[PDB]
Amino acid sequence: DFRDIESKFALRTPEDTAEDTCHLIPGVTESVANCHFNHSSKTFVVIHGWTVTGMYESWVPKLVAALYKREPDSNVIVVDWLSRAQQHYPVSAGYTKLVGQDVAKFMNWMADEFNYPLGNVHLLGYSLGAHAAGIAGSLTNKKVNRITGLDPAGPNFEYAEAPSRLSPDDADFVDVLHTFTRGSPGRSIGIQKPVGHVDIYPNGGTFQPGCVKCSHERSVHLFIDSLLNEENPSKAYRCNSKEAFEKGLCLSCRKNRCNNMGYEINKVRAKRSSKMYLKTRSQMPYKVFHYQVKIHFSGTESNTYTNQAFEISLYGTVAESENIPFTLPEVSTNKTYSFLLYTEVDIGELLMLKLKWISDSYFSWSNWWSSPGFDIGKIRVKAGETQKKVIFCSREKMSYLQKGKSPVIFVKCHD
Amino acid sequence: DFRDIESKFALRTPEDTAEDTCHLIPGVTESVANCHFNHSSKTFVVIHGWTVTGMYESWVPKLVAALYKREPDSNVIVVDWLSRAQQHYPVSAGYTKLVGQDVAKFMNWMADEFNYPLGNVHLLGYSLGAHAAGIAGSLTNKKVNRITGLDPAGPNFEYAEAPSRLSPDDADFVDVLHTFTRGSPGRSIGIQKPVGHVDIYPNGGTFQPGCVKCSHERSVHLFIDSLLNEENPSKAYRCNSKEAFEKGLCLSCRKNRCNNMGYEINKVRAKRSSKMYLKTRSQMPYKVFHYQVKIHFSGTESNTYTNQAFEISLYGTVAESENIPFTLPEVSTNKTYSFLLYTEVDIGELLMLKLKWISDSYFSWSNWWSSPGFDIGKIRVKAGETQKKVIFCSREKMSYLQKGKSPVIFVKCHD
């Protein structure tokens, strides 16, 4: 052996939940005999990240079961961070480059022991483990092809240098998921910067409101539910900022302005640190569909903004939605607005649109159980997947805005 | 003069509400000078019917306004029943044939005074006036072409002879409207027999539930709203009985099994005293659309009938309906039922069907807020107008019957 590794190794098997089946000893010894290894196989390696107490991360069994059922003949290896974990948090950040040197010796081992092509390997991890993976990928003699960092750490790595962090040149393709950008960068965990080729801000990137501490457990749950549901990947959209995407002007994707999420990013490289966006549900598998609208208003009386309590329903060929309350901070005459539609079901082909503006909490009455209304019609839509430039229309009576008991309907017409 | 008429005559004008403008004196005197008459015109004559007190029927101004706006250059003439009215009710029935002889001398007058072709005249009336009109049409030397009797009388004319009543041979085409067949034939007003070529039983023919006495008054209202709305006549359907039509097996009209109502009966004669049916609304103009359904049930558990509290909604291209509660006295597994859909609006082309079986009054709970349900799908429909043999289908989840909060949806499919 060259550098005596203190971290114990474990090449895991699908018949293993939360223990070690086969320990791979360091040094150039027997490796394929005790631990099963296939050269014509997939090698996805993980790093256990920062643990405050002495505990192995409880989400490993569902993890290794998910990657083993997703890909047969898989070589999954985990390292023990607890050999150099139970110390101070910046001191653990100091030990990140030593464990990076350890995994550096690891992928330098079979580079000449087995002469691996290193074009079929995967490296992934979270918190300080993803940072050590980025350091190791920065060190690499032969450039690694893929890395999916999960939710990284915070105030230890502030304006650090590129070999000491994740970088686009650290791999052929770098992906990252900032679940938790909430709070101060110098205090809270999470970096507010597009550190990789692509970066994700799920549920706005601040925090998932499902409510444990709910910051990296999400980042592994959406990844495992992305890789299980391989036939319908979640479609992320390139945009400029959080609120610009929330208004919904970044859902065209006529050119490369949108891509998938999770395991398959469709192998698009040479990126300019662009911002890529999603919304998500909470505690059911996360395949939220997206839609954007182009609403039109009219009226010569020129009334102004009052309230944001509006609800809309949707009926379609495949499924149905009851009601989705939303918030529009500006509403007036002769103006076009837009807001996002996040749906838990696949509506599919469209027939008609249902609208219910009761506003029961925020000014339902408005001085005669009715508001001074506008005339609403010619609402256009755009689907978050593929393209749908279709034209709708309204009818005569229910184009008027009315506060409470207002079942406004819409209808498709093509002429 | 041959027979000195006691009834005063009035050839009415559109500038007349409830009075006499021009009195036409009896006997062969001047007739076209004082009262305006055009030979190339339409002559629709009326008879004021039975009045308990001394009163001219208050619905004459809207009547004569409606026939004058419907047909320009119209010769409308009314007689005074009050000359021989204010006596006993069978004694008034005795005077019906004397006023029939009076109007007999009337249409025998210009048969040789002006040599009228008598193929452009109309005779109409109600209560005993329609009976006297039938007697006069039975007497006629040249056969009259048209008569629209309104709601006739009751116990005076029970199993009477054909010259003493309305009959198919009394005219070329005889129409009648039994609004009120409720009660005993020997006590209540109204005959329970197809006295004419066609007969109508509106709202089942018992009574219109709009709630005055609400009987004959209703009759004249549906006739005037039929003649005002000439572009969309109410479509009556030939059937066998009241409940057979109420179940809805008489709405095909592939052959002559349906016709219009009001003024225009499409000139179909030589009838075999068939029963012809309608439903109607109350105190708005009466153009109720009709639909019939072919619902299918399934299930091997073989559950039986419990309740009849079901509600259904309809969404379409043109309009919408909120909910229409109905009653089905038999519901079970693997059985096909049918019930009528009476709508106040024109739904038009169809997209999808909405069903809400809350049954909040009649057993909404059913021991766990849910009932042991059936699987429902493949519902066919048939429009009351023209034909619509279209095929629909259901989806996977909401085919199950559930008591309360049950938004069952349906979808059109053609493959």
Residue numbers in the entry:
A (entry chain B), B (entry chain A): 36 to 246, 267 to 470
Quote the passages of the study that discuss this structure, keeping the authors' original sentences.
In addition to acting on triglycerides, LPL has phospholipase activity, making it essential to regulate where and when LPL is active to prevent off-target hydrolysis events. Active LPL is needed to prevent hypertriglyceridemia, which is a risk factor for cardiovascular disease (CVD).
Using cryogenic electron microscopy (cryoEM), we determined the structure of an active LPL dimer at 3.9 Å resolution. The structure shows that LPL forms a homodimer associated at the C-terminal domains (“tails”) of both subunits. This suggests that LPL homodimerization, binding to GPIHBP1, and LPL helix formation are all mutually exclusive states.
